[PDB]
Amino acid sequence: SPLPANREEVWKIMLNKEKTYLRDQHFLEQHPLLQPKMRAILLDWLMEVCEVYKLHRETFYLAQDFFDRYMATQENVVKTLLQLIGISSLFIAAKLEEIYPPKLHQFAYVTDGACSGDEILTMELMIMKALKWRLSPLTIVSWLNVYMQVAYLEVLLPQYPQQIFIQIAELLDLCVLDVDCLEFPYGILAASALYHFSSSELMQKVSGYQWCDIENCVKWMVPFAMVIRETGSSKLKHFRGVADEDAHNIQTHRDSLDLLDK
Amino acid sequence: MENFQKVEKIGEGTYGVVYKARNKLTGEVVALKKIRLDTETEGVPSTAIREISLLKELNHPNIVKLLDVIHTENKLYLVFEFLHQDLKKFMDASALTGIPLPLIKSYLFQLLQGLAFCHSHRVLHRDLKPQNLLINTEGAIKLADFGLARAFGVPVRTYTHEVVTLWYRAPEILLGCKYYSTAVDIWSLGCIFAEMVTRRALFPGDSEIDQLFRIFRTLGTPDEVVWPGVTSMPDYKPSFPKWARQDFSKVVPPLDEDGRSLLSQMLHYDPNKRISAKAALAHPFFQDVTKPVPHLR
Numbered sequence: 001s002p003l004p005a006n007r008e009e010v011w012k013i014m015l016n017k018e019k020t021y022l023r024d025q026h027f028l029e030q031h032p033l034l035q036p037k038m039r040a041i042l043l044d045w046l047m048e049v050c051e052v053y054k055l056h057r058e059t060f061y062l063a064q065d066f067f068d069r070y071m072a073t074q075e076n077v078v079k080t081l082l083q084l085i086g087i088s089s090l091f092i093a094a095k096l097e098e099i100y101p102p103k104l105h106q107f108a109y110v111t112d113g114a115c116s117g118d119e120i121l122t123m124e125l126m127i128m129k130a131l132k133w134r135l136s137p138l139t140i141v142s143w144l145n146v147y148m149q150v151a152y153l154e155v156l157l158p159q160y161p162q163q164i165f166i167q168i169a170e171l172l173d174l175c176v177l178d179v180d181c182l183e184f185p186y187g188i189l190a191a192s193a194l195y196h197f198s199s200s201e202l203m204q205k206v207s208g209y210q211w212c213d214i215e216n217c218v219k220w221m222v223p224f225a226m227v228i229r230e231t232g233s234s235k236l237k238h239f240r241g242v243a244d245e246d247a248h249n250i251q252t253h254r255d256s257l258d259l260l261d262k
Numbered sequence: 263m264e265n266f267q268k269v270e271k272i273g274e275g276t277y278g279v280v281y282k283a284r285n286k287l288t289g290e291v292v293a294l295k296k297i298r299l300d301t302e303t304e305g306v307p308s309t310a311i312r313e314i315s316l317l318k319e320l321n322h323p324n325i326v327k328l329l330d331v332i333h334t335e336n337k338l339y340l341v342f343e344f345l346h347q348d349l350k351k352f353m354d355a356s357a358l359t360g361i362p363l364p365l366i367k368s369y370l371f372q373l374l375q376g377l378a379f380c381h382s383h384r385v386l387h388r389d390l391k392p393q394n395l396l397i398n399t400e401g402a403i404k405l406a407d408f409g410l411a412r413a414f415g416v417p418v419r420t421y422t423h424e425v426v427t428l429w430y431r432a433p434e435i436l437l438g439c440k441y442y443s444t445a446v447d448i449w450s451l452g453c454i455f456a457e458m459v460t461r462r463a464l465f466p467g468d469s470e471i472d473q474l475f476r477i478f479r480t481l482g483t484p485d486e487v488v489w490p491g492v493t494s495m496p497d498y499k500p501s502f503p504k505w506a507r508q509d510f511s512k513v514v515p516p517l518d519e520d521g522r523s524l525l526s527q528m529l530h531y532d533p534n535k536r537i538s539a540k541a542a543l544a545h546p547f548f549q550d551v552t553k554p555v556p557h558l559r
């Protein structure tokens with residue numbers, strides 16, 4: 001445990017949550033009509049709706065995880081079902097995570113008529129019943145939050161720079177767009193992205209993993225990290241009605257589709 | 263429900279009704295929480311989704327068990343284990359007699375084990391009140407109604423303000439703090455510990471300012487010494503009356519020195535210094551119920 005309830009007890013419960021929430025990197029093999037890029041365009045679009053409604057990064061990553069894990073239970077999904085499966089994964093996520101989530105009609109409206117409120121209601125129950133109501137994962141962005149606090153040392157009060165968080169989050173947003181990310185545990189992916197913006201010493205100190213635990217994910221993440229570096233990282237945005245100390249937790253969107261091609 | 267016969271309505275809220283139900287061929291009595299979906303404009307309520315998922319990962323002998331979830335036509339039934347009574351009915355029935363000190367200590371010990379389990383899994387209950395603490399005829403007490411519960415991050419972020427029932431609400435919530443976590447549940451448990459001892463709610467306010475003044479009259483008006491940052495909190499007023507801290511021999515007369523010590527640490531103003539559920543379990547007040555475990559390193 002990298003943390004300073006018991007330190008090892010809280011940390012082991014967290015590590016044993018990735019071990020109970022199972023996800024497979026080649027889930028799109030069960031859906032032969034689908035190609036890995038369909039998943040990328042969908043997740044990218046979900047990030048943009050998240051930014052439009054000033055939704056938290058956590059609710060995007062809950063929706064990403066519900067979608068990828070839901071698809072592992074299904075078979076023969078068509079390109080036309082994707083928008084409903086995704087917007088319904090986001091409906092569940094926003095209701096679980098936001099204080100005042102957008103209303104059902106706002107979720108139907110953002111699909112431009114392709115999904116009705118009743119279709120989303122039917123889909124959220126299919127999703128929740130297929131996931132056996134296991135809707136509380138430790139997301140990729142949740143690990144980044146844990147690591148950013150330990151870097152700037154009380155672990156429950158948020159004390160860390162917002163702009164650095166955004167730059168690491170931006171790299172994770174690109175990597176999640178590729179289905180091969182699912183081969184690596186969520187904690188490993190966040191620690192590897194953090195490593196690309198720092199070092200193994202900072203990584204091990206804030207995450208507890210050794211460099212051999214992370215080495216494989218680091219090499220896989222290499223191309224995604226260089227495309228971000230080539231373009232120059234983003235600046236922390238301001239959002240009306242969102243407090244300054246919470247601005248780093250709002251999901252943002254950019255040309256990640258172009259960046260993913262390289 | 264083709265095998266559970268509804269026997270009696272035992273509860274009612276914004277999202278559905280709770281029934282006592284008996285299995286016809288087994289004789290297994292359960293609590294059925296019915297949520298009518300056809301009446302909701304937002305589908306399955308956020309409270310029902312949080313309660314189900316959080317409870318699927320919280321199996322503990324001091325947490326009420328969610329046995330099953332059933333979707334039927336335009337309804338959602340949550341099946342829970344049944345307990346014959348809540349702590350409010352028990353304290354009321356024992357108001358003239360009193361609750362024996364060993365049973366108070368045992369219920370507190372168990373509630374703290376259920377709470378330390380929640381907190382170690384990063385779950386805040388946020389609705390600890392006597393009616394949500396269920397007892398059986400075998401000396402057990404369990405945490406129930408996770409409808410207002412929430413998973414928290416490390417570090418935490420700004421959560422829902424209006425969160426605990428008034429009489430059990432912690433002063434950092436009443437004073438408008440931006441952040442809160444596990445210490446709010448410990449404050450409610452401290453209020454219930456004193457309520458078990460005296461059979462009277464410790465802080466029975468009728469409004470938010472009245473709740474704060476009842477707290478201040480008992481524990482004394484907090485200042486920068488006992489609570490660094492109080493005077494810079496959104497709802498702090500320099501005009502607040504200055505009361506002196508009362509002696510716990512008058513606040514909780516039947517309580518012994520160890521009981522008083524534990525209670526004062528659970529009702530510490532500063533959420534950062536308020537005792538955790540894990541550390542409360544190691545307090546000398548419980549020495550005759552638990553044995554310390556050897557610690558590695």
Ligand SMILES: C[C@@]1(O)CCC[C@H]1n1c(=O)c(C(F)F)cc2cnc(NC3CCN(S(C)(=O)=O)CC3)nc21
Pocket residue numbers: 272273274280293295326342343344345346347348349351352393394395396406407408
């Ligand atoms: C938590 C609640 O008390 C709030 C109102 C409904 C209750 N309730 C639940 O909500 C849940 C689950 F849905 F959360 C499970 C549950 C289980 N068993 C009992 N048993 C009852 C205890 C109270 N008594 S009493 C008045 O003291 O005689 C009668 C028998 N109640 C339960």
